[PDB]
Structure 1
Amino acid sequence: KSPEELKGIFEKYAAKEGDPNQLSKEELKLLLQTEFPSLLKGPSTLDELFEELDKNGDGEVSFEEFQVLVKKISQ
């Protein structure tokens, strides 16, 4: 998906609660489940990518971190 598309999806779930410019791990799980169900298949690397990308260790990732996460978890 294009970044413009990806931004709209990210915002929709981040808006659920907390900071509208961050996504917690649970918000990311609901987002993948409904938007990219195929990315949640077989052994997962979600927690490893999540831990590496959440640099400030606050349990949340920014839009650019999310983009990287979708990209990497896909290959």
Structure 2
Amino acid sequence: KSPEELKGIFEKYAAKEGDPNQLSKEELKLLLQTEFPSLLKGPSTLDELFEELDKNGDGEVSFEEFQVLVKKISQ
């Protein structure tokens, strides 16, 4: 999906609670589940990518961190 499309999806789920410009891990699990179900198959690398991308260690990722995450978990 295009970054424009990706931004709309990101915003939709981040809006659920907390900072509207951040996605927590549970918000990201719901988003993947309904938006990219195929990315939640087989052994997951979600926690490893999440741990590495949440640089500030606040349990949340920004839009650019989410983009990299979708990119990487895909290959």
Could you report, residue by residue, the CA deviation over 1:5-58 in whole angstroms, capped at 9, with x for unpaired residues? 000000000000000000000000000000000000000000000000000000
Q: Please give the secondary structure, in 2, of the residue aligned with 1:51.
A: helix
Task: Give distance in 1, aligned partners of 2:17 and 2:9.
Answer: 15
TM-score of the superposition, structure 2-length normalised? 1.00
Could you report, residue by residue, the CA deviation over 1:43-74 in whole angstroms, capped at 9, with x for unpaired residues? 00000000000000000000000000000000
Q: Report the identity percentage.
A: 100
TM-score of the superposition, structure 1-length normalised? 1.00
RMSD over equivalenced CA pairs, Å: 0.1
**1:9 equivalent in structure 2:** 9
Task: Give distance in 1, aligned partners of 2:56 and 2:49.
Answer: 14
Task: Give distance in 2, aligned partners of 1:4 and 1:23.
Answer: 17
**Runs of at least 5 residues in structure 2 that lack an aligned partner in the other structure:** none
- 4+ residue runs over 2 A deviation: none
Task: Give distance in 2, aligned partners of 1:41 and 1:50.
Answer: 16
